[PDB]
Design an enzyme around this catalytic site. Structure first.
Site, PDB file in Angstrom:
ATOM      1  N   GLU A   1       0.953  -1.421   0.099  1.00  0.00           N
ATOM      2  CA  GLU A   1       0.118   0.024  -0.010  1.00  0.00           C
ATOM      3  C   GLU A   1       0.873   1.211  -0.144  1.00  0.00           C
ATOM      4  O   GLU A   1       1.368   1.462   1.262  1.00  0.00           O
ATOM      5  CB  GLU A   1      -0.973   0.013   1.115  1.00  0.00           C
ATOM      6  CG  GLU A   1      -1.822  -1.230   1.430  1.00  0.00           C
ATOM      7  CD  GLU A   1      -2.788  -1.332   2.323  1.00  0.00           C
ATOM      8  OE1 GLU A   1      -2.706  -0.068   3.261  1.00  0.00           O
ATOM      9  OE2 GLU A   1      -3.559  -2.150   2.736  1.00  0.00           O
ATOM     10  N   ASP A   2       1.017   1.877  -1.226  1.00  0.00           N
ATOM     11  CA  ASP A   2       2.047   3.066  -1.333  1.00  0.00           C
ATOM     12  C   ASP A   2       3.505   2.919  -1.106  1.00  0.00           C
ATOM     13  O   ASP A   2       4.163   3.915  -1.149  1.00  0.00           O
ATOM     14  CB  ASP A   2       1.291   4.204  -0.753  1.00  0.00           C
ATOM     15  CG  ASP A   2      -0.160   4.305  -1.171  1.00  0.00           C
ATOM     16  OD1 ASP A   2      -0.505   4.019  -2.349  1.00  0.00           O
ATOM     17  OD2 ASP A   2      -1.016   4.760  -0.350  1.00  0.00           O
ATOM     18  N   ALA A   3       3.893   1.926  -0.482  1.00  0.00           N
ATOM     19  CA  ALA A   3       4.951   1.768  -0.086  1.00  0.00           C
ATOM     20  C   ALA A   3       6.209   1.654  -1.165  1.00  0.00           C
ATOM     21  O   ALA A   3       5.689   1.264  -2.440  1.00  0.00           O
ATOM     22  CB  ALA A   3       5.510   0.609   0.900  1.00  0.00           C
TER      23      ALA A   3
ATOM     24  N   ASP B   1      -2.599   3.009   5.427  1.00  0.00           N
ATOM     25  CA  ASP B   1      -2.268   2.905   3.999  1.00  0.00           C
ATOM     26  C   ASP B   1      -0.532   3.050   3.723  1.00  0.00           C
ATOM     27  O   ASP B   1      -0.157   3.315   2.427  1.00  0.00           O
ATOM     28  CB  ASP B   1      -2.792   4.125   3.192  1.00  0.00           C
ATOM     29  CG  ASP B   1      -3.173   5.300   3.742  1.00  0.00           C
ATOM     30  OD1 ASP B   1      -2.793   5.458   5.332  1.00  0.00           O
ATOM     31  OD2 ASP B   1      -3.772   6.463   3.249  1.00  0.00           O
TER      32      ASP B   1
ATOM     33  N   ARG C   1      -5.818   6.064  -9.005  1.00  0.00           N
ATOM     34  CA  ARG C   1      -5.522   7.434  -8.770  1.00  0.00           C
ATOM     35  C   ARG C   1      -5.505   8.038 -10.294  1.00  0.00           C
ATOM     36  O   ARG C   1      -5.347   9.365 -10.450  1.00  0.00           O
ATOM     37  CB  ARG C   1      -4.146   7.497  -8.293  1.00  0.00           C
ATOM     38  CG  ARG C   1      -4.326   7.099  -6.809  1.00  0.00           C
ATOM     39  CD  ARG C   1      -2.964   7.277  -5.968  1.00  0.00           C
ATOM     40  NE  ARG C   1      -3.041   6.953  -4.677  1.00  0.00           N
ATOM     41  CZ  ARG C   1      -2.084   7.234  -3.764  1.00  0.00           C
ATOM     42  NH1 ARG C   1      -0.915   7.848  -3.985  1.00  0.00           N
ATOM     43  NH2 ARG C   1      -2.303   6.704  -2.481  1.00  0.00           N
TER      44      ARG C   1
END
Ligand SMILES: *[C@@]1(O)[C@@H](COP(=O)(O)OP(=O)(O)OP(=O)(O)O)O[C@@H](n2cnc3c(=O)[nH]c(N)nc32)[C@@H]1O
Ligand SMILES: [Mg+2]
Ligand SMILES: [Zn+2]
Lengths: 731, 125, 50, 422, 120, 54, 149, 248, 99
Positions: free
Chosen positions: A694-696, C2, I1
């Site tokens: 997750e976004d890492a 997140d 996104r």
RNA sequence: UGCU
């Protein structure tokens, strides 16, 4: 510091005391001088902003003045006497940084690329944010709390600011003011203001059948009472007036000065005020039908107060306080001290203005009692996280709301922000929508004399409002003309008037910042000349062809002409929000059609400074751009060429900063490539080891070892060794 | 009542009928002239400084243009606000310091406005 | 969460009874479903479903 | 659009310039007029014009209520006092119209009388709006107040002799402060008293139906010929525009207009300092054709040099004696010497090597780049080339100037060889 | 404190502060001046003195505070801004220094030279 | 409708005299007797037939 | 309102057809398509917006309101109810969005952001009240839910 | 779920009108149990759900109809004998709307909470003519009250429930049969159930206070449960019914 | 996104570092995708950024091509070293004896 | 003032 301070000094040039007449203190001319430091023993010495930051002192200049007074009836004059210290803004007219080459900046230990424009007090850098408030002297028709469609007007002059409302709570127009015990009918005010004929009142209100049907209840309520003359109406108003024929005189004074201060009366002649209230009632009646309610979020009715106006008001208040204190000291000293004649020089406080300015700039809370203004958060610490951060914070705008209610109205993005403010640049959090940044290409207008504007309006055939009755206001072809909220008069065929005014402004006989707008729904032509309005340059288009050509662009590139030459040659002109509301603009040349008046200079200028760093922003999402601006306001990188000598409480620097490969024209303009805040790395978009869920992201050990991402954190530890009252010191 | 125009008004006042009519025109603040031996300065030049006789001409071009040639410049005359209330033109002559005479010359019905042709004044030089 | 800068809190109980109650009642293996509708919240996520 | 017809003449009259007033009734439509209403008198003042008309209205007409007339008469006046009565009889017979001033100055307004082929203009001395005033109600209120006072006094049948001797209540004429004095002056009561101080003048009314109306109506005309050339009204459009709109009172700060307003020498100096590369023909076109070519040549020869037919601004003009390099801080003399060397190299050969110039002048890369960009462009595989082509037309037209520039460049070359030891 | 103080002592303190602010001396100098003025006022001979005596006391306290920090300030300007004459000023200065016995650092020559040169 | 007094301009109210109904002013003896029928229609907007939804 | 609904329906039909065409023309092994199919992240709506065409920018469930007098932006004619003048985005994220389309998208994004910001506090207050009211009940051993009293 | 809900719009429940507050504000209003709620909705069933004529008839019976909305013109005529207000009823629009309102019904509606107008003041001359002749009440009121009458007469109720503001005919197009129902934006369930032609046994309302005051505490609980469940389902998120049952 | 702008920036940066140029990402303009694709195909790299990549762990080629390219990454001031916190008994407040 |  050049004109407004002199005007304030001229306004408060003479101060005298009631006791012991023939005594006075006359101010002749005030000077601010160059920035100096009072460190030396009664000696001035030029001090640099970097030295001020290092020594935790203020970067101010000694305010001096030449005065003349009478000590013992013998006039004694002084050619130079200090009275205070004004913090000098960096890169100003009197600042030491202006008119300097990068070599001299290096000698003075200052970055050439530093935006400046901020004050340095006690070592901290404070920036006065631009305040956004509603335009004054304007009628606003809106729904009340319960839902009653009424009107309001906040008349603000140089002395007093009064808000008066009008409601239709019971089918009749009641006017409400802060100086009245109870709201009174509008017909009584009409009768008190000179116009006593009900026929004339109805003609001024309107001649439409629905207008008369709606105004009938007010006439009936007025006829129910025995009020039929100006004397009786004034007596009723005085009876309804709150404590601060005597009642009649007070009522007349309130009607002439207190109510609708912006509408001037020559000599107790309320004709203009009567016409104004009649037009207001007509607008209310028209709004009572079709729901044409004006919106507060329309930036065409917004005004931006820069630091200059705030500093002017603060200086005026401080000077008035100093004059009052001097008068009190004189009244207390002269009559009973001694035969030794008293003079002001022995009590002229030279620290009062200095301390007032220092406190108002440092603490940020401004409390002006003369205007009853209690503002907070005016000044904020300049964020030195990066050059981009400082440049974006310098061009911020705060709102008058200041997080009062989650209205979502002003927080929403209005279409009126086109070309003026950055749509995507907004802080993410509780301040979303209230803190905004200016666009790349925009300007804020100042105040004009309004003399030639009135002269041209009168010469263009604008009929005097006092010459004709109000019945002409109800005609469909007769359009009202307003000037800064004041009724300038009436006109017919407003197209010719607008065309001639625009042609004259392009010629140059009228200031290019004076805006002219026309609203057909109300049939009103507004001529705006007050400061704080947002304007944007646009290329003039005439007959499907722009005035600017390739020859003109080549001349500009070679240096034959400049932007001022373009403005003077009627090629590019400044347009306001209200003016572009009526004018047609084209994005590109291929979009130009027959009905086009202007052409967009560049589309990418819509974005702000922080948003200009986004490469290909029109291919991404709006929240992505918002988050990108928010993170770029904290991005790590170099601050300036003097970052090594600069000593701040917290600084972040990058070991091997590299300029971006995909750089924007905005980047080239702001010279961010010279002070980058990041590095270009060979990134591979893929999933690896499941440590980037997750976004890492996954970094390379060898890359980090070879210096990639290396950062330096600089912290400051300050200690003070001060001497107390007793002859002892910390050692 | 449809909104009339100055050219048609003059046409119907001169050709359709011959009866005289009293008009009220609003002239600009400063006229394109100089006060003749009035002890000055570029000050305002109104009708109080000009003498009697022919001072200008009224021209009516095609397409409804009504112009006023008052010398080297040419103003344009348009219809002013259509007043419907009573307007009585009177002359109050104070022949004696104790008694005067009020004479009703006529009634005013139409209003005219004369404006400088700023477009022409700008494109000339 | 997140993993984009979230700061989370970590607490250590100072009593055996509290430790046992936390392990039993607030156990991850025992709270795999929410009491709202019984749907499981602790399941596969992005980069695992694909 | 040509003036095919309607070539009406305009005449001016000054007979009734100071005796012409404009009275308008905002509450009376144009259909009904006061021609049939018998007037009585009119109160007026010469200064601060405010006329008050006193007319008479009929009573026997069906549109009048006699009972209400008696009531209002008894309310405004006494029973049989009749010493100061607003009405002669016991009925409302007289009506009062008060005038309000529209504007102070009425010089821009004029009355136009239209005749067959001519229009006569007469100035207006004043414009006033007449509206029905309500002063009988105020007098009735005062009457009611005095009646209430009389009732309070006569509450008893026989009122004993009251010992209400007026004690000497002579208040101080205290020295009024400036603020309070200004407030008193600006008060409405003071203005009303000042207006009332002026005496009134009574005037008779002559209706339009009277013969005097048609007798005096001819004064709006003026005796004169049809075609007369006015001595005045002969100003040019530029003069009229200046009258109706009187005035209020980087190195490219000055605009084109501000530049042209400066002398020719300053114009040429500023143009050279801004552009630094421009042909003589372009300079002539920018300055204007009305300026002499010899004058422009004299102006440019002092602030520019000839390089391959083109004109390049001198080094000292760009770099004053007190200036310095913005990048390295070296004195302006070194910058001038380097720029002169660059110009000499360009004159000798169109292609100039940046590395050679840097090695010879011992200057820094940024300064050399600035010097080369000021007068040249980058060409791939060729180095730096002069931005403008070879202009042989000016060289052929002005041979003496070419010789002067050649000898000046020879002297500059000698100086450069002496300094840099070429 | 600040309650067992007379109006005369309060006026003297306010005059001390006013002169200090006119001369633009730091708040440390103001505190030292008020402390020395209070210390001098403790004595009865200065407490029940002349109006000119207490004015010169204000001036001398300011002068002592200025001297204690090696700051140059001419007694001529002090008398000019204090509404007093040099004779009585010096007499009261000698009286108060003899009554108190505080340290009186000598006026450094270089500091006065710099202060007077900045005037030109 | 709304009627005004030609003398002063104030609003006129309908009252009953000694012979017939008349318009009269509250500030002057002016009156006006009614000879023929006088009407003032307003034509209020009727409620349209709200059709079914769906 | 009938015209508004018809225009919105036409724009939705265009968007759906463009998305269907993009999904049919896209070949397998495509990463966005595979992710949308497996449901890990993204969807066909986002794929069509970023490839085929962006949908109608709806503010409060309606087209872009007229910020200026009788028009949203000065670049369009007065009383013009065209799709591109009222909020329709013809171009996709790949081809690039025009200035007006980008401005409308930013308007919608800021509206969503402020809506979420208000929702956070509103639901926090609601949850606080609900818990403070319902924190007294508990399940007893006799299968009867009873309060504290 | 309060955080999970995004407070969407355009959810007209299939009628494309009658904006109803749903989501977190609706949950707040429900948990607060305010006496007066925003946009109350009352759903009523019909005995004859297939007859549009009967549906319109019951709609007109339940919906408030003002005098000015049915009358074609109202004129204040001042005859030389007397002054009175004449109202002309549009019988065509009356029969088009299927409203059982005639001159007698209008006369009965008049003289109800209107400055105490006596029955003798109002009279009927024709089939659709109403003549109103007021009299001075002596309480600071004279014959010149015809203006107040003109102001407040068109807003008098002649047929329908005063609390009811807008009733519409909703249609369900189930393949088995197309049925009709009444959607009322009012705050009076008792009157809606008492009106003729309305199946009061299957009438639901959104105002919990009215449901409690009308049908009892158990009906209020059932209505609360159903409304919370519907509001939660509108956002696509589901909650076990036991939670809402315990809350109710 | 829907961050196609990131992919466009990566492709433009790859083209720029290959051809020794600086592409422009100007809003509502800038370098198009066709130009950078032509630059890539001229320099010999794939016209879509995806290149043949071999796995470093197993040493075998990947079934799908990886999207490589230079991206301008910027570090933020948010550091885990500064955000890390651990509180022992420690001090307390005078008014209320709490941390 | 910043962060989710
Ligand atoms: C910011 O501009 C202002 C606004 O702060 P307020 O929220 O108005 O302060 P408050 O109303 O008094 O909030 P509270 O009641 O919770 O204490 O004030 C500065 N500022 C406020 N709060 C902070 C903060 O927590 N941290 C920093 N660094 N600055 C703050 C800001 O300038
Ligand atoms: Mg997060
Ligand atoms: Zn009257």
């Amino acid at each position: 510091i050049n004109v407004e301070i002199k005007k304030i000094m001229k306004a408060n040039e003479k101060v005298t005391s009631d006791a012991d007449p023939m005594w006075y203190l006359k101010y002749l001319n005030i000077y601010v001088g160059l920035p100096d430091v009072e460190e030396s023993f009664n000696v001035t010495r030029p001090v640099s902003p970097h030295e001020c930051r290092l020594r935790d002192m203020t970067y101010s200049a000694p305010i001096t003045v030449d005065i003349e007074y009478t000590r013992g009836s013998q006039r004694i004059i002084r050619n130079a006497l200090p009275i205070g210290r004004m913090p000098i803004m960096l890169r100003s007219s009197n600042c030491v940084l202006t008119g300097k080459t990068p070599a001299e900046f290096a000698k003075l230990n200052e970055c050439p690329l530093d935006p400046g424009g901020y004050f340095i007090v006690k070592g901290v850098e404070k920036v006065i944010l631009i305040q956004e408030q509603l335009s004054k002297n304007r009628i606003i028709v809106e729904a009340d709390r319960k839902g009653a469609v009424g009107a309001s007007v906040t008349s603000s002059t140089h002395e007093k600011k009064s808000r008066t409302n009008m409601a239709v709570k019971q089918g009749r127009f009641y006017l409400r003011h802060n100086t009245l015990s109870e709201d009174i009918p509008i017909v009584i005010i009409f009768k008190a203001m000179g116009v006593e004929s009900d026929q004339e009142i109805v003609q001024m209100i309107g001649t439409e059948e629905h207008v008369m049907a709606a105004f009938g209840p007010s006439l009936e309520e007025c006829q129910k009472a025995q009020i039929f003359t100006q004397m009786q109406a004034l007596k009723y108003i005085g009876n309804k007036v709150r404590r601060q024929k005597t009642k009649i005189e007070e009522a007349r004074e309130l009607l002439a000065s207190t109510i609708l201060t912006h509408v001037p009366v020559k000599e107790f002649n309320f004709r203009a005020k009567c016409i104004y209230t009649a037009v207001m009632v007509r607008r209310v009646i028209l709004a009572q039908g079709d729901n044409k309610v004006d919106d507060r979020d329309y930036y065409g009715n917004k005004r931006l107060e820069l630091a200059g106006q705030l500093l002017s008001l603060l200086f005026e208040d401080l000077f008035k306080k100093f004059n009052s204190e001097m008068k009190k000291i004189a009244d207390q000293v002269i009559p009973k001290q001694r035969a030794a004649q008293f003079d002001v020089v022995k009590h002229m406080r030279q620290d009062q203005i200095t301390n007032g300015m220092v406190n108002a700039i440092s603490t940020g809370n401004w409390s002006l009692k003369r205007f009853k203004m209690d503002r907070q958060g005016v000044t904020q610490v300049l964020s030195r996280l990066s050059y981009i951060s400082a440049l974006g914070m310098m061009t911020r705008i705060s709102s008058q709301f200041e997080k009062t209610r989650k209205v979502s109205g002003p927080r929403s993005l209005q279409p009126s922000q086109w070309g003026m403010l950055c749509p995507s640049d907004t802080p993410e959090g509780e301040a979303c929508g209230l803190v905004k940044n200016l666009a790349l290409m925009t300007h804020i207008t100042t105040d004009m004399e309004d003399g030639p504007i009135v002269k041209l309006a009168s010469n263009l055939g604008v009929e005097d409002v006092n010459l004709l009755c109000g019945e002409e206001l109800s005609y469909p072809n007769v359009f009202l003309v307003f000037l800064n909220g004041n009724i300038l008069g009436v006109i017919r065929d407003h197209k010719k008037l607008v065309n001639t005014f625009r042609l004259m402004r392009r010629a140059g006989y009228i200031n290019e910042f004076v805006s002219i707008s026309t609203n057909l729904t109300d049939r009103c032509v507004y001529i705006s000349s007050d400061g704080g309005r947002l304007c944007r340059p646009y290329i003039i288009v005439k007959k499907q062809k722009p005035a600017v050509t390739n020859k003109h662009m080549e001349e500009l590139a070679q240096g034959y002409r400049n932007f001022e030459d373009f403005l003077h040659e009627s090629l590019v002109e400044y347009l306001d929000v209200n003016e572009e509301n009526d004018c047609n603009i084209a994005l590109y040349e291929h979009t130009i059609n027959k009905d086009t008046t202007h052409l967009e200079i560049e589309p990418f200028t819509l974005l702000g400074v922080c948003a200009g760093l986004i490469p290909y922003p029109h291919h991404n999402q709006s929240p992505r751009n918002t988050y990108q601006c928010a993170m770029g306001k904290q991005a790590m990188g170099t601050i300036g060429y003097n970052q090594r000598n600069r000593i701040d409480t917290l600084m972040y620097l990058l070991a091997y900063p590299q300029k971006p490969m995909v750089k924007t024209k905005t980047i080239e303009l702001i010279e961010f490539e010279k002070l980058p805040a990041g590095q270009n790395a060979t990134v591979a978009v893929m999933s690896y080891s499941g440590y980037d869920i997750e976004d890492a992201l996954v970094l390379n050990k060898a890359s980090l070892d070879r210096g990639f991402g290396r950062c330096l954190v600089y912290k400051n530890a300050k200690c003070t060794l001060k001497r107390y009252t007793n002859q002892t010191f910390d050692k | 009542l449809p909104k009339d125009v100055s050219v048609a008004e003059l046409l119907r006042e001169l050709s359709l009928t011959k009866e005289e009519e009293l008009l009220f025109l609003q002239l600009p603040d400063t006229l394109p002239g100089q006060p003749p031996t009035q002890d000055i300065a570029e000050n305002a030049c109104t009708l109080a400084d000009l003498t009697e006789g022919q001072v200008g001409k009224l021209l009516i071009r095609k397409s409804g243009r009504v112009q006023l040639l008052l010398g080297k410049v040419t103003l344009d005359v348009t219809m002013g606000t259509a007043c419907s209330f009573l307007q009585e033109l009177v002359s109050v002559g104070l022949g004696d310091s104790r008694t005067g005479e009020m004479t009703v010359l006529g009634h005013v019905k139409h209003k005219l406005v004369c404006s400088p042709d700023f477009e022409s004044l700008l494109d000339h030089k | 969460a997140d993993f984009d800068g979230d700061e989370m809190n970590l607490h250590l109980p100072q009593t055996e009874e509290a430790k046992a109650e936390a392990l039993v009642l607030m156990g991850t293996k025992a709270n795999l479903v929410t009491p709202r509708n019984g749907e499981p919240l602790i399941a596969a996520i992005q980069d695992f479903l694909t | 659009d040509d003036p095919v017809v309607q070539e009406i003449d305009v005449y001016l009259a000054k007979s009734l310039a100071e005796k012409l007033y404009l009275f308008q009734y905002p509450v009376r439509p144009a259909s009904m007029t006061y021609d049939d209403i018998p007037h009585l008198s009119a109160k007026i003042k010469p200064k601060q014009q405010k006329v008050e008309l006193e007319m008479a209205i009929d009573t026997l007409n069906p549109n009048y209520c006699r009972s209400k007339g008696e009531q209002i008469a008894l309310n405004v006046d006494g029973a049989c006092a009749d010493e100061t009565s607003t009405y002669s009889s016991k009925l409302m017979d007289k009506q009062t119209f008060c005038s309000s001033q529209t504007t102070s100055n009425t010089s821009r307004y004029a009355a136009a009388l239209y005749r067959q082929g001519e229009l006569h203009l007469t100035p207006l001395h004043g414009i006033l709006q007449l509206r029905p005033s309500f002063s009988y109600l105020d007098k009735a209120d005062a009457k009611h107040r005095e009646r209430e006072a009389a009732n309070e006094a006569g509450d008893s049948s026989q009122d004993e002799a009251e010992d209400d001797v007026k004690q000497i209540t002579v208040r101080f004429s205290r020295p009024e402060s400036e603020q309070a004095r200004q407030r008193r002056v600006q008060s409405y009561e003071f203005l009303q008293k000042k207006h009332a101080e002026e005496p009134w003048v009574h005037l008779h009314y002559y209706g339009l139906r009277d013969s005097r109306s048609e007798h005096e109506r001819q004064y709006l005309l003026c005796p004169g010929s049809s075609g007369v050339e006015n001595t005045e009204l002969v100003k040019s459009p530029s003069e009229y525009l200046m009258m109706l709109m009187p005035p209020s009172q980087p190195s490219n700060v000055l605009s084109m207009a501000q530049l042209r307003t400066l002398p020719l020498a300053d114009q040429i100096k500023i143009l050279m300092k801004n552009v630094k590369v421009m042909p003589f023909a372009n300079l002539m076109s920018l300055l204007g054709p009305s300026i002499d070519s010899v004058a422009v040549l004299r102006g440019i020869q002092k602030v520019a040099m000839l390089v391959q037919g083109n004109w390049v601004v001198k080094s000292d003009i760009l770099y004053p004696k007190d200036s310095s390099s913005p990048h390295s801080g070296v004195p302006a003399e070194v910058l001038c010497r380097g720029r002169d060397f660059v110009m000499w190299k360009f004159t000798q050969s169109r292609w100039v090597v940046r590395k050679e110039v840097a090695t010879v002048t011992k200057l820094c890369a940024e300064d050399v780049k600035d010097f080369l960009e000021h007068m040249a462009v980058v060409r791939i595989n060729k180095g730096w080339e002069f931005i403008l082509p070879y202009d042989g037309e000016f060289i052929k037209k002005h041979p003496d100037v070419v010789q002067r520039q050649h000898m000046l460049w020879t002297g500059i070359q000698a100086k450069l060889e002496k300094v840099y030891n070429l | 404190e600040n309650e067992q103080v007379s109006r005369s002592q309060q006026r003297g303190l306010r005059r001390v502060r006013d002169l200090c602010r006119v001369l633009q001396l730091p708040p440390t100098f103001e505190d030292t001046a008020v402390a020395y003025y209070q210390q001098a006022y403790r004595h009865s001979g200065i407490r029940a003195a002349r109006l000119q005596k207490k004015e010169v006391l204000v001036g001398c306290c300011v002068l002592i505070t200025c001297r204690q920090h090696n700051w140059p300030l001419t007694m001529g300007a002090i008398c000019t801004l204090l509404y007093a004459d040099l004779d009585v000023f010096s007499s009261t200065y000698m009286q108060i220094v003899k009554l108190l016995g505080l340290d009186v650092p000598s006026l450094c020559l270089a500091e006065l030279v710099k202060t007077y040169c900045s005037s030109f | 409708m709304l009627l005004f007094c030609p003398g002063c301009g104030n609003g006129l109210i309908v009252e009953e005299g000694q012979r017939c109904h008349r318009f009269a002013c509250n500030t002057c003896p002016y009156v006006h007797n009614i000879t023929r029928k006088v009407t003032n229609r307003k034509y209020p907007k009727l409620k349209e037939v709200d059709d079914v939804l769906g | 309102e009938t015209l508004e609904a018809l225009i919105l329906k036409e724009l939705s039909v265009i968007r759906d057809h463009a998305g269907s065409a993009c999904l049919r023309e896209l070949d397998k092994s495509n990463s966005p398509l595979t992710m949308a199919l497996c449901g890990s992240k993204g969807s066909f709506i986002n794929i069509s917006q970023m490839i085929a065409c962006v949908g109608q920018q709806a503010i409060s469930g309606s087209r872009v309101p007229d910020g200026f007098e009788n028009r949203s932006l000065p670049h369009f004619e007065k009383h013009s109810k065209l799709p591109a003048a009222k909020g329709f985005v013809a171009n996709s994220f790949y081809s690039g969005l025009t200035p007006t389309e980008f401005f409308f998208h930013t308007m919608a994004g800021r509206e969503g952001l402020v809506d979420t910001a208000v929702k956070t506090a509103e639901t926090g207050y609601m949850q606080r009240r609900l818990v403070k009211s319902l924190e007294d009940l508990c399940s007893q051993y006799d299968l009867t839910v009873r309060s504290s009293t | 779920p309060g955080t999970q809900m995004t407070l969407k719009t355009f959810h007209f429940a299939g009628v494309a009108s009658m904006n109803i507050t749903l989501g977190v504000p609706r949950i707040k209003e429900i948990i607060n149990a305010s006496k007066a709620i925003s946009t109350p909705i009352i759903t009523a069933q019909l005995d004859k759900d297939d007859d549009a004529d009967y549906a319109r008839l019951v709609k007109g019976r339940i919906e408030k109809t003002l005098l000015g909305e049915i009358s074609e013109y109202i004129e204040e005529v001042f005859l030389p004998d007397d002054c009175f207000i004449l109202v002309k009823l549009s019988l065509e629009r009356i029969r088009l709307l299927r409203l059982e309102v005639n001159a007698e019904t209008v006369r009965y509606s008049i003289c109800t909470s209107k400055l105490r107008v006596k029955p003798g003041d109002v009279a009927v001359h024709g089939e659709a003519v109403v003549c109103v002749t007021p009299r001075e009440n002596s309480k600071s009121s004279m014959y010149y009250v015809l203006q107040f009458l003109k102001e407040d007469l068109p807003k008098v109720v002649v047929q329908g429930i005063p609390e009811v503001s807008r009733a519409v005919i909703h249609i369900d197009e189930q393949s088995g049969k197309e049925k009709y129902k009444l959607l009322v934006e009012g705050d009076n369930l008792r009157a809606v159930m008492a009106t003729h032609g309305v199946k009061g046994t299957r009438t639901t309302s959104n105002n919990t206070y009215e449901v409690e005051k009308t049908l009892g505490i158990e009906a209020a609980r059932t209505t609360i449960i159903n409304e919370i469940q519907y509001t939660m389902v509108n956002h696509g998120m589901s909650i076990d019914r036991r939670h809402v049952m315990l809350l109710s | 996104r829907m961050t196609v702008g990131k992919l466009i920036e990566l492709l433009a940066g790859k083209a720029g570092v290959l051809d020794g140029r600086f592409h422009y990402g100007t809003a509502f303009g800038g370098s198009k995708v066709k130009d950078v694709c032509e630059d890539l195909v001229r320099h010999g790299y794939n016209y879509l950024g995806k290149d043949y990549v071999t796995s470093g762990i197993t040493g075998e080629p990947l079934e799908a091509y990886i999207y490589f390219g230079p991206v301008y990454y910027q570090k933020l001031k948010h550091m885990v070293l500064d955000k890390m916190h651990a509180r022992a008994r420690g001090p307390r407040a005078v008014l209320t004896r709490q941390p």
